[PDB]
């Protein structure tokens, strides 16, 4: 590939210090985020391409979905705090976008219960200051890269992936170009 700023990636005007090496932002209301998760498996394929020691971080954003949007950011904080992201990502995406059965915080709670998280544990986490701090961390991270939309990925707080500039004829070629761009940027 001939990597070029503006094509596969763009460069932040003011790089963020102490940023995660690979930082993804998403919303459970975001249609492309649904595709990135269920059909393209972007995070898994980026992980596979990168060295074993690279930290990948994934944060939820507030600006899709009204009040339920805020609740989902708090729920994603719960998931991070309990380490159950992989248990709830699909039923949260599908509950919001596919079946549209997630309408309130109670419905979000039911998803966690059905994914095996004990209700008492969910409630304790939901109300915890660990979770409150993770909510603040997600919001600050988005602010720091001046985030305007999702999905988004940032490498070393300097470079932003530009999927728009990639080939969309074949799903697996798209994923390969995306992951290979992350690898190129990571060792930049």
Ligand X SMILES: Cc1nc(-c2ccc(C(F)(F)F)cc2)sc1C(=O)N[C@@H](CO)C(=O)O
Question: Interface with ligand X by CB under 6 A: which residues?
Answer: 32, 40, 65-66, 68, 149, 151, 163-164, 168, 171, 174
20, 94, 138, 153: residue in contact with a copy of itself (rule CB under 8 A) = 94
Q: Shortest approach of ligand X to residue 130 CB, angstroms?
A: 25
Q: Shortest approach of ligand X to residue 167 CB, angstroms?
A: 7
* 25 is a site residue for a copy of itself (CB under 8 A): no
25, 26, 29, 59: residue in contact with a copy of itself (rule CB under 8 A) = 29
15, 38, 137, 165: residue in contact with a copy of itself (rule CB under 8 A) = 38
Cα torsion for 12, 164, 97, 64, to the nearest 10°?
A: 30
* 97 is a site residue for a copy of itself (CB under 8 A): yes
* 184 is a site residue for a copy of itself (CB under 8 A): no
For ligand X, give the closer residue by CB, 151 or 157: 151
Q: What is the binding site for a copy of itself (CB under 8 A)? A: 29-32, 34-35, 38-39, 63-69, 71, 93-94, 96-100, 103-105, 167-172, 174
């Amino acid at each position: 590939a001939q990597y070029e700023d503006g094509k596969q990636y763009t460069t932040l005007e003011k790089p963020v210090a102490g940023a995660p090496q690979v930082l993804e932002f998403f919303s459970f209301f975001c249609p492309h985020c649904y595709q990135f998760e269920e059909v393209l498996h972007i995070s898994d394929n980026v992980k596979k391409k990168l060295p074993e020691g690279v930290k990948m971080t994934k944060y939820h954003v507030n600006f899709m979905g009204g009040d339920l949007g805020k609740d989902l950011t708090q729920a994603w904080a719960v998931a991070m705090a309990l380490g159950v992201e992989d248990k709830v990502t699909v039923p949260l995406f599908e509950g919001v976008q596919k079946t549209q059965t997630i309408r309130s915080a109670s419905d979000i709670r039911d998803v966690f219960i059905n994914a095996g998280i004990k209700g008492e544990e969910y409630d304790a986490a939901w109300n915890s200051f660990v979770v409150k701090s993770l909510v603040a961390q997600q919001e600050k991270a988005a602010a720091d890269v001046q985030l305007r939309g999702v999905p988004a990925m940032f490498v070393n707080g300097k470079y932003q992936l530009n999927p728009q500039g990639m080939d969309t004829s074949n799903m697996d070629v798209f994923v390969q170009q995306y992951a290979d761009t992350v690898k190129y940027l990571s060792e930049k």
